[PDB]
Amino acid sequence: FFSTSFKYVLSACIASFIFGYQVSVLNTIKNFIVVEFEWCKGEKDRLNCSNNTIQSSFLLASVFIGAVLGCGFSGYLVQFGRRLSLLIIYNFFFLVSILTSITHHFHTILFARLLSGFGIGLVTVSVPMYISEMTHKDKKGAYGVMHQLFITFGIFVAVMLGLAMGEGPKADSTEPLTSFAKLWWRLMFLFPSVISLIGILALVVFFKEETPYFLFEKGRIEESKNILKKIYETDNVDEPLNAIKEAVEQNESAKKNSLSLLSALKIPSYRYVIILGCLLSGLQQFTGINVLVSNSNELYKEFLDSHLITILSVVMTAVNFLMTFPAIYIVEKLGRKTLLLWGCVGVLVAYLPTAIANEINRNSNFVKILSIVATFVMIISFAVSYGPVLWIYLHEMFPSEIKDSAASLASLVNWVCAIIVVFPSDIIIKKSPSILFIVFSVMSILTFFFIFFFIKETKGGEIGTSPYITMEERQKHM
Amino acid sequence: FSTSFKYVLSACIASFIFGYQVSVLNTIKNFIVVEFEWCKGEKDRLNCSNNTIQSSFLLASVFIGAVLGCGFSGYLVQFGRRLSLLIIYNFFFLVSILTSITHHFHTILFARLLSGFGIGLVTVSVPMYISEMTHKDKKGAYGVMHQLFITFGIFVAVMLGLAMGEGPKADSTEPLTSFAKLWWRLMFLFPSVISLIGILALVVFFKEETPYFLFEKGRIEESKNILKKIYETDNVDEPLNAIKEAVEQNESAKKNSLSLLSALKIPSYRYVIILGCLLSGLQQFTGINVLVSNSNELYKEFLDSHLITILSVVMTAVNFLMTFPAIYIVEKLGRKTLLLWGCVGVLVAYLPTAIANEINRNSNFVKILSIVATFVMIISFAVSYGPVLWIYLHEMFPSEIKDSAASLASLVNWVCAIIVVFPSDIIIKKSPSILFIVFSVMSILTFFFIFFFIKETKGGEIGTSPYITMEERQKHM
């Protein structure tokens, strides 16, 4: 259904779109910066050299480290508001897009990409929590899948705009880049400025209210009543205010007992749910998803040419975008634990045979075809499950007293594990893919058993509840 | 050097960064011109048309950013004064970082645009913070600290550029020294370290907000606490009542929906608003920013490179030394007196030079007269108009529009900088007699405007203005 809840969640999905677009737009056009910026002007080949590898590694380290920092600071910025965080995100990305688009050196664009990763880190926490507190509880997951839905649409859009370009600068060539190339790569960088302005317009014109949970939590009880009546489309909103009123009584009880996130870590009951979130969020990167997102080109560069890789990237990202839709219906109909475990199964289906085949014959044609299609398996499984479900889960698994802080910590762990996985995986897939893919298979099975034994279902809960800490296991202790 | 002094110095670190970011670009610009190679397609590597165009753009970006920063600081300060200082510090930390690593005209232009945004934030936030963290009897004396450290920042900026050689020759082609390629980025970055120092100072010792704002927003007991902290005495009910009346006038004004534009329709408020705008913008018609912005362009014609070095150093040092006497005089004499004497001084500086250029444009003594007249103008501005304006704008408004109108006037100052400096940069190139006679006419006009319209504001309680009286503020619609 397209309700008021849906309009507001969509308002936040613009920040989600900027998330995805900034994740992938660098990789879309990086050959053209390598040529234009003359990173390899001393070697025979202009797209591949020592200098390019070094600096292009840093241009990803920027995104990931800035996302670590941005998720860390999202915990203290959301303290001062959710809708505020969306306006900060939009106003921030507007300027960072401008700067990225006007840089003429590796340092300025490294700075701009680190700022862009900080924006990513803000979005990761801000948008899913906003959707968590701005939605009908029955539809928390359906609309939380919209977060990842629009992230994926951002990636797909970034890939689609690059095809308006010339689809390659000759590497062996000494030919300067086309004027339209030199322009459209900067224009692609700047497009998110327009998108940011659109988000700001939508926030300031139509969707002015903040989340009912927050307003009730900060004393403005009648503004809570108003915006909750507006997301629920009725004057009768007793039960959601009961959810919010009890969760907020819990927040202030905990703050009376001085239960900061660190103090809760000295409490076992809270520490268990916290570390469960940390591990579920850090394991999302052990799929190698950003090994494929960052090095979508570098992986298949051994056995494929430019045209097929263009088409591959397009259909890969489009399949990614189209497989998030089913998750909208699955996350709610089945449950989150269910879809998560099915995702593990899909990723194992993908990785184990590539490991086996590479162990048989790395240089096999069957191995190359199998690599292509196993990649698509990983994508179809990731897009319909873990992707959406993690950001849905993290803002439903935590008690109200540490709901916001714990979510930011888990998102920080997500980006830190991205650092852990992506950068060594591109060393190992170069050396021995069998080691890599057997590790990812074992991680699929390990994560499966972890989720099966420890991870509990979270569908349908009111705001500020956890299946890990009952009500009495948290008020009296906190 | 009371507690109020500690708090105002905490705010004056931002004033230091203000001045530094203002003159640091101009101090080392030759070096960037050589690195970025804006004029390499000619025989002369420092002087060409493209340099003129892009340098004018860099200065205009700073000015436009200051306009935007003051206008936005009006809306920012309602969320906090010390908050404005924090946002400014973080902002300039990262802007100094970016300014330091720029390698193109566009990135450094964008960097200076943001630097000007922070400039405009400071221009409004810092004088207000000092206005509300000090004794009502010492608002002016501590308000000079703002401009005192501003001038100190310009002095530091010019001083550090001397550690360089100033050997990016116009006739040479020799590549810049490694230390030279390093030091101007280090100078752009130094305000990052200074921003860190300021953030530290604010967050550790000077945690409390201003009493006026705290009472404006409900924290009455914390208003009392920080009031007793700055005043070093607990029974300070009189400042609390000044705040109570100003804040009650604020709440009653918002009750009738008094925004700045709503006050513009009531003549009572519109009068003091346009007085503020005019007094604030008239500070720029002294030609002070024509000299600060185009310091080298004025004396490159009759002065050599080393001679420009010493002249800039000593006039900037004089600016800084002569901002000190205002600290005592603003409180001993008042603002109107010191303003009128400043107009006198500026006329003494310009009018002899104006007539002298018509006497003999190419006179050996006209150059000497211009040097002495420059120092007369510098001394005149630094001790009076410079310090006094930002003191005046945060005492002359009723509290219903105190912050909003203060921000509007501080904005107008920067708009007038644009209206003056660039037409001045073009006119002084043609006929200094006309420009100096116009600046002298402006001295006379400013003198009479201040003389007839501008009232004394010393000793007024916070939220008090000599233009609108307490019962007049009540005048029901």
Ligand SMILES: CCCCCCCCCO[C@@H]1O[C@H](CO)[C@@H](O)[C@H](O)[C@H]1O
């Ligand atoms: C977050 C972004 C930070 C990027 C800058 C990190 C420090 C890089 C060291 O300085 C570099 O030294 C080179 C000569 O040695 C110069 O060619 C180059 O211009 C300069 O930048």
Ligand SMILES: CCCCCCCCCO[C@@H]1O[C@H](CO)[C@@H](O)[C@H](O)[C@H]1O
């Ligand atoms: C206490 C919370 C109230 C703040 C929200 C009020 C409505 C939205 C205002 O957002 C505006 O977005 C612009 C982006 O261009 C900013 O430039 C501008 O400064 C800011 O005012």
Ligand SMILES: CCCCCCCCCO[C@@H]1O[C@H](CO)[C@@H](O)[C@H](O)[C@H]1O
């Ligand atoms: C409140 C005191 C701190 C609790 C310490 C954490 C260990 C107890 C948590 O129970 C867990 O329940 C799961 C059922 O879903 C089991 O599968 C799992 O084996 C078990 O560990």
Ligand SMILES: CCCCCCCCCO[C@@H]1O[C@H](CO)[C@@H](O)[C@H](O)[C@H]1O
């Ligand atoms: C879920 C994983 C999705 C991975 C998608 C990452 C996209 C980055 C791949 O860059 C590709 O480089 C080519 C030139 O080299 C371009 O022609 C092409 O447009 C672009 O797509």
Ligand SMILES: CCCCCCCCCO[C@@H]1O[C@H](CO)[C@@H](O)[C@H](O)[C@H]1O
């Ligand atoms: C985290 C990985 C994301 C899924 C990608 C699946 C396999 C990608 C193909 O890899 C490439 O093909 C051969 C193996 O198939 C190797 O010989 C080659 O060195 C490797 O670069």
Ligand SMILES: CCCCCCCCCO[C@@H]1O[C@H](CO)[C@@H](O)[C@H](O)[C@H]1O
């Ligand atoms: C109150 C008036 C303040 C005016 C100060 C303006 C400073 C900018 C002038 O540039 C000067 O040019 C030289 C090379 O061009 C530099 O070496 C020198 O350090 C610098 O000072």
Ligand SMILES: CCCCCCCCCO[C@@H]1O[C@H](CO)[C@@H](O)[C@H](O)[C@H]1O
């Ligand atoms: C890149 C350098 C690191 C930037 C970090 C910015 C400083 C954190 C924000 O400041 C804090 O805001 C609170 C407002 O309530 C105050 O309570 C507290 O005293 C103050 O310290």
Ligand SMILES: CCCCCCCCCO[C@@H]1O[C@H](CO)[C@@H](O)[C@H](O)[C@H]1O
């Ligand atoms: C904002 C102005 C500050 C005070 C003015 C005095 C210092 C500048 C002097 O001007 C310069 O010296 C001669 C004027 O006597 C002219 O020959 C020359 O064309 C002119 O460029």
Ligand SMILES: OC[C@H]1O[C@H](CO)[C@@H](O)[C@@H]1O
């Ligand atoms: O969907 C692809 C992206 O989503 C994840 C976060 O949800 C990122 O790590 C990944 O690059």
Ligand SMILES: OC[C@H]1O[C@H](CO)[C@@H](O)[C@@H]1O
């Ligand atoms: O030191 C003089 C400076 O003060 C004025 C602001 O009051 C600036 O324009 C000028 O650079």
